Design a protein around this ligand. Structure first.
Ligand SMILES: [Cl-]
Ligand SMILES: [Cl-]
Ligand SMILES: [Cl-]
Ligand SMILES: [Cl-]
Ligand SMILES: [Cl-]
Ligand SMILES: [Cl-]
Ligand SMILES: [Cl-]
Ligand SMILES: [Cl-]
Ligand SMILES: [Cl-]
Ligand SMILES: [Cl-]
Ligand SMILES: [Cl-]
Ligand SMILES: [Cl-]
Ligand SMILES: [Cl-]
Ligand SMILES: [Cl-]
Ligand SMILES: [Cl-]
Ligand SMILES: [Cl-]
Ligand SMILES: [Cl-]
Ligand SMILES: [Cl-]
Ligand SMILES: [Cl-]
Ligand SMILES: [Cl-]
Ligand SMILES: [Fe+2]
Ligand SMILES: [Fe+2]
Ligand SMILES: [Fe+2]
Ligand SMILES: [Fe+2]
Ligand SMILES: [Fe+2]
Ligand SMILES: [Fe+2]
Ligand SMILES: [Fe+2]
Ligand SMILES: [Fe+2]
Ligand SMILES: [Fe+2]
Ligand SMILES: [Fe+2]
Ligand SMILES: [Fe+2]
Ligand SMILES: [Fe+2]
Ligand SMILES: [Fe+2]
Ligand SMILES: [Fe+2]
Ligand SMILES: [Fe+2]
Ligand SMILES: [Fe+2]
Ligand SMILES: [Fe+2]
Ligand SMILES: [Fe+2]
Ligand SMILES: [Fe+2]
Ligand SMILES: [Fe+2]
Ligand SMILES: [Fe+2]
Ligand SMILES: [Fe+2]
Ligand SMILES: [Fe+2]
Ligand SMILES: [Fe+2]
Ligand SMILES: [Fe+2]
Ligand SMILES: [Fe+2]
Ligand SMILES: [Fe+2]
Ligand SMILES: [Fe+2]
Ligand SMILES: [Fe+2]
Ligand SMILES: [Fe+2]
Ligand SMILES: [Fe+2]
Ligand SMILES: [Fe+2]
Ligand SMILES: [Fe+2]
Ligand SMILES: [Fe+2]
Ligand SMILES: [Fe+2]
Ligand SMILES: [Fe+2]
Ligand SMILES: [Fe+2]
Ligand SMILES: [Fe+2]
Ligand SMILES: [Fe+2]
Ligand SMILES: [Fe+2]
Ligand SMILES: [Fe+2]
Ligand SMILES: [Fe+2]
Ligand SMILES: [Fe+2]
Ligand SMILES: [Fe+2]
Ligand SMILES: [Fe+2]
Ligand SMILES: [Fe+2]
Ligand SMILES: [Fe+2]
Ligand SMILES: [Fe+2]
Ligand SMILES: [Mg+2]
Ligand SMILES: [Mg+2]
Ligand SMILES: [Mg+2]
Ligand SMILES: [Mg+2]
Ligand SMILES: [Mg+2]
Ligand SMILES: [Mg+2]
Lengths: 173, 173, 173, 173, 173, 173
């Protein structure tokens, strides 16, 4: 139009927010796939399942907050296909946690690139939005996944017969 | 393996359930797109937004119930890309409701085809699952959308200046 | 039009639902007639009266659920005259119960014919509707009436002076 | 017999009460037809539907009170067929309200004729019954329907697109 | 007689229900045997014991519901001897769970055969009964047992000294 | 082994306890058969049904207490087939009560023989177990059944039309 609300909002920032929306929806789908891997009759780790389902729902919330930001700033949401995850068979609790840690680091890198663009375009509202709602949640998530990977490795996952079971019951319980 | 749980569960039924999972996830994404159309500063119908967001969340629940069914029966979930919706700009409250009614009829037709396959394969568990959790919810949804389309048309949407506003406030409020 | 909601709904099913609506309204009227027979000053069995009045109200509910189904599916309700019952004088508590059992078996046979038509027309929504809300309620009703007929016969109704009175007070109380 | 209870109760009064029972049951059926007209997917005025359904239930209560009166006085209920209503398609909220007002005036005229007969036969119990439970309820009903017709006409029903919708939401809500 | 209640109820269905009653009572007895195996002083897994005792009681409930169905439909219950289980010594928690999974699949196959007979005899009441109360409970039971077998196998049962103990305490606790 | 718990527990006592377990399970099955006789549509005495169902459940409890005793003492449970009852058609409320009294006297005689064996083998734990949990419950049961038989006989069961009905409603109510 531009939108009657738009102010100090660069087209490059608008496009980068649309890309980030797709990545958060993609993360949601990866964790959904993982959740239902853990409720297979030949995996049957119900607390891993609940853990990943909760992560999936959180990613959807992250996507929605960016969609709200796009509207608040007068940008226009442009959705793209949500790619299927890389695996349906996630192999083990340890492997899923390692894949989740890598996914979170990848999403972090995208958010840091977004913040660098917002800085370059002199958009302190957008910088503040990312800092307030994204950057510290991402650091907490990466640390939690790092902790879970460490314990599973030390316990002897995936081959040690008791390791994933005991982690499921105690840590994720 | 087959799965140690699998019984009376045809490979064609397993594949058709995977296709239905994708369609429900697709429906969820269509309604998500609609919800955030209605919170644009140049649309600003917050009750249309909440209505479609609620529908989006319901579709995700429908997808998840099929994913649980796949696991319960010993089938293997196979996810595919979730296609983007046909529009980002949904034009008006009336147009969105008409698109939603068509989407629900399309999803209904797929569920009826699934039930016909389950009957052909002598799978009464699967027939019962669809009847109990899907077929009547779909009929209720189609009827509700038909009612909403009728009122918006009679009120003079989309061109009558008060129609969508008054429908937003009273019916969807 | 067809209706914008109509899907997989055969004209023969629509007509058979209208016929079933009339039969349920007819059943309601038979039981209403019976209820007020039992509050005549020369019959004066108030618990038989309440029993049949409750049955009358249930039949109206059954009719209304079919009328709602017709609307939900996009069919058009077509009402017909409600025929008067076969008797105003129902002769005795035993005779009324026997007539009620025959009426329920007749209504059952109509519902089974309706379900057979719905199956033939590949309408699993309609099949499920009948199974969920009608077929098992009909079996329960027929069994209850069979039980009541048995006890009244064994007790010596209608000629044994205490039989209907004692049944009124204990069983129907 | 006569009935051991019968006193001061003329055969003409007994017959006129049976005719009035049929008319109240007929009124109940007219309003039932109207209620389900308003829940069609191409009408979808749920508060008109609830209004008429409530009226239908009230008419049944009026019929039942006359049936109780017949028994109390020692007369014998004689039921007749309940004729189908004149329309299944009631055209509009305004048209339904106009038909309902005419029906209520017709039922009123019958009740006044009944009261005139009771006076002629020197039956003050029957006169009092009609005055206490019927005549003033009928006047209130006619006035309410007159009010509703007036507002719908002034608002521009049935052609004004907002009129029936706004009346549904505010007045009948 | 036939029974005054009997309608649309084939003699073959009546006989097959009597056979299914015996099988459910047999299942109850198998699980009772298992429950008291786990409270032997040389087994002493009290949560396995409680798990199987609960399953035993559920099977009795399933038998009783079929006995009620036989009466409701006007069939006549014909009881047969309840065969003793195949073992008194159930060897291990893993072996018991594997035997229970096989028993549940066998009972499932019988129920599917019963549903196929009911379909062949055009008995939708009986089809609905099995679908509503049996088929989905059986699928849930088979899935739960599959999950338990998987975890016990992965944990190293029966030879791993901690596996059954830890499963007893955490999963079955 | 012997069991590490076994002490002062003779092999003959162990075998006699296994025989008594079978007899209690047999009693449970007799009463289950009776319970569902009384809910036939041509018997329809619901309080007789509830009375016998309660007795059936009590017998199962008696069986289970002996199974627990076998484990506590270090004996090994050995289950046998549960024979079907002598009748499916129990003829009348009086006949069922008479059969139940005979069954209870038979079970009593077996328990007295068991107590005599325990005395002979100098097993005061087993003697005390039978005295504390079995012998007085059996005497109470026999007395209650004797009372019920007496009243039904005096009232004129089974031929007097009101006798079983009135007993059902008052005594067993
Ligand atoms: Cl700008
Ligand atoms: Cl951790
Ligand atoms: Cl590490
Ligand atoms: Cl299979
Ligand atoms: Cl609407
Ligand atoms: Cl329209
Ligand atoms: Cl159609
Ligand atoms: Cl009864
Ligand atoms: Cl009989
Ligand atoms: Cl009495
Ligand atoms: Cl008179
Ligand atoms: Cl008004
Ligand atoms: Cl006017
Ligand atoms: Cl307004
Ligand atoms: Cl039959
Ligand atoms: Cl498990
Ligand atoms: Cl495995
Ligand atoms: Cl010893
Ligand atoms: Cl007694
Ligand atoms: Cl005696
Ligand atoms: Fe999280
Ligand atoms: Fe959150
Ligand atoms: Fe959250
Ligand atoms: Fe959270
Ligand atoms: Fe995220
Ligand atoms: Fe791809
Ligand atoms: Fe994340
Ligand atoms: Fe900063
Ligand atoms: Fe919905
Ligand atoms: Fe839901
Ligand atoms: Fe929901
Ligand atoms: Fe909901
Ligand atoms: Fe859906
Ligand atoms: Fe595309
Ligand atoms: Fe939907
Ligand atoms: Fe308003
Ligand atoms: Fe009823
Ligand atoms: Fe009801
Ligand atoms: Fe009701
Ligand atoms: Fe009821
Ligand atoms: Fe009915
Ligand atoms: Fe006629
Ligand atoms: Fe009925
Ligand atoms: Fe079916
Ligand atoms: Fe009494
Ligand atoms: Fe009224
Ligand atoms: Fe009233
Ligand atoms: Fe009322
Ligand atoms: Fe009222
Ligand atoms: Fe009236
Ligand atoms: Fe006519
Ligand atoms: Fe009226
Ligand atoms: Fe269970
Ligand atoms: Fe249960
Ligand atoms: Fe239970
Ligand atoms: Fe349970
Ligand atoms: Fe079972
Ligand atoms: Fe044998
Ligand atoms: Fe089972
Ligand atoms: Fe069903
Ligand atoms: Fe007892
Ligand atoms: Fe007890
Ligand atoms: Fe007890
Ligand atoms: Fe007890
Ligand atoms: Fe006993
Ligand atoms: Fe035998
Ligand atoms: Fe006993
Ligand atoms: Fe003692
Ligand atoms: Mg991307
Ligand atoms: Mg597809
Ligand atoms: Mg008819
Ligand atoms: Mg008339
Ligand atoms: Mg068998
Ligand atoms: Mg024996």
């Amino acid at each position: 139009g531009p939108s009657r609300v738009r102010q100090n909002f660069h087209p490059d920032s608008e496009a980068a927010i649309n890309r980030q929306i797709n990545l958060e929806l993609y993360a949601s789908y990866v964790y959904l796939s993982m959740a239902y891997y853990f409720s297979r009759d030949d995996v049957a780790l119900n607390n891993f399942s609940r853990y990943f389902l909760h992560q999936s729902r959180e990613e959807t919330e992250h996507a929605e907050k960016l969609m709200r930001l796009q509207n608040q700033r007068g940008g226009r949401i442009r959705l793209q296909d949500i790619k299927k995850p890389e695996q349906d068979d996630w192999e083990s609790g340890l492997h899923a946690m390692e894949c989740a840690l890598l996914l979170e680091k990848n999403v972090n890198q995208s958010l840091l690139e977004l913040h660098a663009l917002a800085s370059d375009k002199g958009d302190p509202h957008l910088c503040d939005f990312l800092e307030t709602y994204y950057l510290n949640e991402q650091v907490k998530s990466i640390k939690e996944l790092g902790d879970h990977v460490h314990n599973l490795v030390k316990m002897g996952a995936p081959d040690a017969g008791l390791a994933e079971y005991l982690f499921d019951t105690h840590t994720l319980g």
